[PDB]
């Protein structure tokens, strides 16, 4: 509970996961080139 950089690391991990999610969505849609499930 005294190490505060762990919370910062968690925030960075979540933001990076969202960014990689965006990249994966774009890659999937571009490679598909109907309806989404």
């Amino acid at each position: 509970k005294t190490r505060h950089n762990i919370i910062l690391s968690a925030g960075i991990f979540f933001v990076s996961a969202g960014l990689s999610n965006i990249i994966g969505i774009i890659v999937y849609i571009s490679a598909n080139a109907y309806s989404y499930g």
Binding site: V15, G18, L19, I22, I25, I26, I29
Partner: protein, 44 residues
């Protein structure tokens, strides 16, 4: 073989063929573009 009068009707051969959305201002860009624009706005 028969006598025709003058034409009482004139005709010819002709061609017969079979004869905006509310949110149509979104039509220039695809739906995926708008969705990814929203995602990119959130991420930015």
């Amino acid at each position: 073989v028969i006598d025709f009068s003058k034409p009482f009707m004139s005709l010819g051969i002709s061609i017969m063929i079979k004869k905006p959305g509310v949110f149509s201002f979104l039509d220039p860009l695809a739906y995926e573009i708008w969705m990814c624009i929203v995602f990119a706005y959130i991420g930015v």
